[PDB]
A paper describes a structure:
In the present study, the crystal structure of the human testis-specific nucleosome containing TSH2B was determined at 2.8 Å resolution. TSH2B formed a dimer with H2A, and the two H2A–TSH2B dimers were symmetrically accommodated within the nucleosome as in the canonical nucleosome containing H2B. A substantial structural difference was found around position 85 of TSH2B compared with the H2B structure. The Ser85 residue of TSH2B corresponds to the Asn84 residue of H2B. The TSH2B Ser85 residue does not interact with H4 in the nucleosome, but in the canonical nucleosome the H2B Asn84 residue (corresponding to the TSH2B Ser85 residue) forms water-mediated hydrogen bonds with the H4 Arg78 residue. Therefore, the local structural difference between TSH2B and H2B does not affect the H2A, H3.1 and H4 structures within the nucleosome. The structures of the Thr33, Ile42, Ser61, Thr68, Ser76, Ser91 and Ser125 residues in TSH2B, which are located within the histonefold domain, were compared with those of the corresponding residues in H2B. In contrast, the other TSH2B-specific amino-acid residues did not induce any significant local structural changes in the TSH2B nucleosome. The water-mediated hydrogen bonds between H2B Asn84 and H4 Arg78 in the canonical nucleosome are not formed in the TSH2B nucleosome. This local structural difference may affect the stability of the TSH2B nucleosome. Most of the TSH2B-specific amino-acid residues exist in its unstructured N-terminal tail region, suggesting that these N-terminal residues may function to recruit TSH2B-specific nucleosome remodellers and histone chaperones, which could be required for histone exchange during spermatogenesis.
Author numbering:
A (entry chain C): 12 to 118
B (entry chain G): 15 to 118
C (entry chain A): 38 to 134
D (entry chain E): 38 to 135
E (entry chain D): 33 to 125
F (entry chain H): 34 to 125
G (entry chain B): 25 to 102
H (entry chain F): 19 to 102
Amino acid sequence: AKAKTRSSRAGLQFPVGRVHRLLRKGNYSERVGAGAPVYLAAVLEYLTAEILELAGNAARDNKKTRIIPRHLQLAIRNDEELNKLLGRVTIAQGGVLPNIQAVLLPK
Amino acid sequence: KTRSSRAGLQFPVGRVHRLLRKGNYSERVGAGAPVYLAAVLEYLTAEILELAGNAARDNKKTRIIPRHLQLAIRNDEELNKLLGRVTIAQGGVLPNIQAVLLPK
Amino acid sequence: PHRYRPGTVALREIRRYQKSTELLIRKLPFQRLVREIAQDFKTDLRFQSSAVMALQEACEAYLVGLFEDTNLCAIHAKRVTIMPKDIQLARRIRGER
Amino acid sequence: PHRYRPGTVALREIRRYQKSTELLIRKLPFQRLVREIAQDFKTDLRFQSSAVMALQEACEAYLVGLFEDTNLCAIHAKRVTIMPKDIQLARRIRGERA
Amino acid sequence: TRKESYSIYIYKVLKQVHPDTGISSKAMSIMNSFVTDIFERIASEASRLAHYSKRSTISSREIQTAVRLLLPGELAKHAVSEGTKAVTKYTSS
Amino acid sequence: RKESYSIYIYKVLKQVHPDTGISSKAMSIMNSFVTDIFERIASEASRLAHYSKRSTISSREIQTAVRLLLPGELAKHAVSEGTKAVTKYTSS
Amino acid sequence: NIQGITKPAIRRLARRGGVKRISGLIYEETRGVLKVFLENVIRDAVTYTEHAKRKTVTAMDVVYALKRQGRTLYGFGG
Amino acid sequence: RKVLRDNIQGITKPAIRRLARRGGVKRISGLIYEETRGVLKVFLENVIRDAVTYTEHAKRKTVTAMDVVYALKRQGRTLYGFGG
DNA sequence: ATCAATATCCACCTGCAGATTCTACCAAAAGTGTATTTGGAAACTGCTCCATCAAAAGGCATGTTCAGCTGAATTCAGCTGAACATGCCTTTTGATGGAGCAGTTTCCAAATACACTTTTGGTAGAATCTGCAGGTGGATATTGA
DNA sequence: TCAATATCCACCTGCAGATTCTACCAAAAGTGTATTTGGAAACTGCTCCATCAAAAGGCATGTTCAGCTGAATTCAGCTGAACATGCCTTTTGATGGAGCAGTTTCCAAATACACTTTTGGTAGAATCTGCAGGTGGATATTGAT
Ligand SMILES: [Cl-]
Ligand SMILES: [Cl-]
Ligand SMILES: [Cl-]
Ligand SMILES: [Cl-]
Ligand SMILES: [Mn+2]
Ligand SMILES: [Mn+2]
Ligand SMILES: [Mn+2]
Ligand SMILES: [Mn+2]
Ligand SMILES: [Mn+2]
């Protein structure tokens, strides 16, 4: 019987095995169910797809083909949900969203 | 002949040890860790009670209620910092009125 | 006919309420509100009495605190009257917005 | 001689720095401040440059955010100039004090 | 001295959404920190969720309910769909 | 079922104030307090061990955790009682 | 139901907060903040309820929710 | 080595002005510069104190980027970009 | 409404610092055959969590008056921005020496595993008790005159 | 200051809701053994951190100068406090019933384990290339007339 990676059995790109190990070695609980590493690898994969999709667009917009930190920032900060999720996270080299309070502009 | 009395503590050294193992904190738990942790817990407990007791006294009370625990914490910089994100149920707040809002 | 000047009874109230710890929201209306909100998440729910009490405690402590910060924002703008603009600013600096 | 009015270069600079992401404090001076504070904490210490860079990124991300809030307190007081009392209110409300 | 990373998978997923795009290494490590971070937040909540319900085993159900707690739907609601999906596909051996 | 530090707190109460009592709510508050700090210190201790790839939480991890978690003088005294209790214990 | 939370009740809270003068618009602003607060807390609580397969929100379900929001409450099981 | 002193002044008026700009600030009071150095020093001391604690616990003499990342996480200011 | 003065853009270029691929192991997933548990599933309680009932009691909802707070409008000392001239000291490059992480091994002191043996801690009545909640009677604190 | 409201504030006082005090059984806690093994100690291979040198210019310093912003004043419209009424909704106090947490009691599905092969990844060489930095007209954007 040929080797069938669990990632493939699950239909995922992320490493189901690895995740299954990080779980048993993380002192999170006595034992870990079989589904557990699969559901987590999926969520972790859904989310990184979500930010890369927006990061890639911020890149395209700024006329670059390679995603850099600043693109991750614009992607995260311009998205209410991703922003709330990473509300207390500082992205190195990400800078800030260009934003100037109205009262400050020439009258 | 309990490890607590052996370490000179009122806190359950034995239980702290069981609670450390059953807590999924680590594969193995050192012999002294529960003694230490138990000592630290007792000390902070004595600290609060000691100040809470004083708060009751001054209120002309012999029984420490929640307000007394609140007065003891919020009036001590260290304890307040430690319990900065904690609310004591039924503890109320410190009486403090901003200068500007006073008469004349 | 006797009458205290505006603000004098306000100070009297501050001292009274900063001295006690009783809940300041009427227990019944609060409970009604708590279940209304909960029904929107899961229908036909039961609530331990203490569960509703824990919620009112936290809820009132949260508001009292927010009013402290709001009052500071009002004072910062040379006022003595809290305004929504004050609650909004405090909630922003707090990270709730 | 041509001369921009007070406030115009300031707005130019906001647009300019909100666009970029480079560190705004100088490297060497900051590395020193780190070594000076650390040393008056524990002697014979060493740092991976990486470690000093992580501290600079965080301090700048922090000061920049503190200034966004400071600026809101200024505006709120119907002013356009930030002052110490503004930094103090933002820190008070943020819980960095009371 | 070999050290594990998520880079390989992050890159694969990158090629899927934007085949034309690349990613600087700072950006990649950032992405790495993000993955290990949410993994930590999910696992931990899973860990506690298991404790409260006197269980010594973290099932896909703990992960699910944890996901519902840490993420803001929509993000939540879509993450839960993918997890359910991946699991049943898995149980189909 | 349902064990608490309730009893151990009352003993401590009697050492600092033999004279003083304590309400029901006050007692549960002190109970939540003990479990909370217990959880913060233990958790920080858990990570500290994983950073050094150790499998056991020793009193060394408990102490650093304390130093990281308790502020200023509280941490100092906490640390003193700590190593002291480990001494009057390893003595027999 | 939010109107159940009455003006006098809000004045009282403000007073404990140390507020002397209250603008006429603070009452409606407060009700809104209070409902967002409750929605968030209960939503998490009820999630804890469902996980435990119950039909009853317990005080511990609330206590754990509050900790998730960073609003640790003492005196109800933690 | 050489004695280290007054290095907090290595945080110049122009560097603080730049930081205020990125924070979107338009006009700065003369006193902001010293309040900022004061505020920065407290911030840095706390992060370094915790970071050096993780270092000592690891029986090292070198503060690594990870020590800093962990210190920052304790303070609730998670940093992405140095985890490796 | 003009325009000089300057700053902001944007496409066009080209090596090279920083990605991407190509190769090789080798640490750890996948495959299978056993030795344990666990987490659910029924069945039953005894809890406590609704539902009513139903008076009394505050506590909330109105409408009046007007005190004094918040703005709007004006001014003006001088604080803080924009520019310039100077020349310091942070940057950049390169190259070492060796401090001190990291990677391996070695193996006892220390922690985990039973299998028991006691002792202590949680329960649910029994035996007191600290303060609440009133009740005056006495100086205060406010506020009008 | 004088005087007249209302407010606070001790001193005592009498029970009722909790507390503290008792009287008992299991389930942790302490034990006596018998094993596992984690990680402190002992090297030592070698990245990396602290230093040094030198040159170059990006930028921090200081000083001038005066635009226009923050701080002071004024003044009065009207919002928000103080209050006496009038009345409705919250309290609260058992009763009874019933949904249902909490406990048990099984055990079949699901995991932990112990080995044995097979890859999927990670660590560098070997290749590739976006884009960082420079230039220059094309276009605003400002600010004086
Ligand atoms: Cl599972
Ligand atoms: Cl130990
Ligand atoms: Cl407003
Ligand atoms: Cl100021
Ligand atoms: Mn006993
Ligand atoms: Mn100079
Ligand atoms: Mn002005
Ligand atoms: Mn008038
Ligand atoms: Mn292969």
